[PDB]
């Protein structure tokens, strides 16, 4: 990664890089606004757009998908990225497009899906698609949501709220929960999500914040783990990440805590 970010070190990814693990032979689908494949620092192995008004997955008119792709590669420099456009330039998309992206990922043997997206209300059809991806063996990771808190209510967005999906909240560089990061019992783990520098469309770079930035740290961690343990199931990868996380406080706010990919990968 050309642009320096604290987040890679914070999740203990360099320990895996020192070991020789970089996420080789792991297919990671970025279900987002596209990936700017023309960026000199990003290689994209394949993809598909399901947004009828934005037909090219290898451009990104929003910036999030490109940034997220870069974070996956900062954590797992050898991962294979796939651009699955399910959100338009305004960052918004429909259930059915998301489903089509999940279905494509299953058909194309993805190992990991990242969904840095959410709705306050669930789709029963998206639930069916994410459940099927997990049953098929895919590690499904999602942003927990940027809906802050609501007293004792969960604010975890869908599909992160489903049991089958790993719900990733955001901490800052001090390991404090970001004010925006959604909360609730459905929260699994935390990762860095404040002022993360990564790739932006047009060969650019910059900092963004959100649970959208936290999720790809966990997707990249999954790729690192699979490169060390290519025989592990998605169940085992998920267990590793959750059971070895660094506890940070009450699970309503932090889940199991900050991922520690060095511990997760043994």
């Amino acid at each position: 990664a050309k642009c320096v970010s604290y987040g890679v070190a914070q999740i203990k990814a360099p320990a895996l890089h020192s070991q020789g693990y970089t996420g080789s032979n792991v297919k990671v689908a970025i279900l987002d606004t596209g990936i700017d494949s023309s960026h000199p620092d990003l290689n994209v192995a394949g993809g598909a757009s399901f947004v009828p008004s934005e037909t090219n997955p290898f451009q990104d008119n929003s910036s999030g998908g490109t940034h997220i792709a870069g974070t996956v590669l900062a954590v797992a420099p050898s991962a294979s990225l796939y651009a699955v456009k399910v959100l338009g330039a305004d960052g918004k998309g429909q259930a059915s497009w998301i489903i089509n992206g999940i279905e494509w990922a299953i058909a194309n043997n993805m190992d990991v899906i990242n969904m840095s997206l959410g709705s306050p209300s669930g789709s029963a059809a998206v639930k069916a698609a994410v459940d099927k991806a997990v049953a098929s063996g895919v590690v499904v990771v999602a942003a927990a949501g940027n809906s802050g808190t609501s007293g004792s209510s969960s604010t975890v967005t869908y599909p992160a709220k489903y049991p089958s999906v790993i719900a990733v909240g955001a901490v800052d560089s001090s390991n404090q929960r970001a004010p925006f990061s959604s909360v609730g019992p459905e929260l699994d783990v935390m990762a860095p999500g404040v002022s993360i520098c990564s790739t932006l469309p047009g060969g650019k770079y910059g900092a963004l914040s959100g649970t959208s930035m936290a999720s790809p740290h966990v997707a990249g961690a999954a790729a690192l783990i699979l490169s060390k343990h290519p025989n592990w199931t998605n169940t085992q990868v998920r267990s590793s990440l959750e059971n070895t996380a660094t506890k940070l406080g009450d699970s309503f706010y932090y889940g199991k805590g900050l991922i520690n990919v060095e511990a997760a990968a043994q």
Binding site: G118, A144, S212
Partner: peptide, 4 residues
Amino acid sequence: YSAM
């Protein structure tokens, strides 16, 4: 659905 929105980007987070």
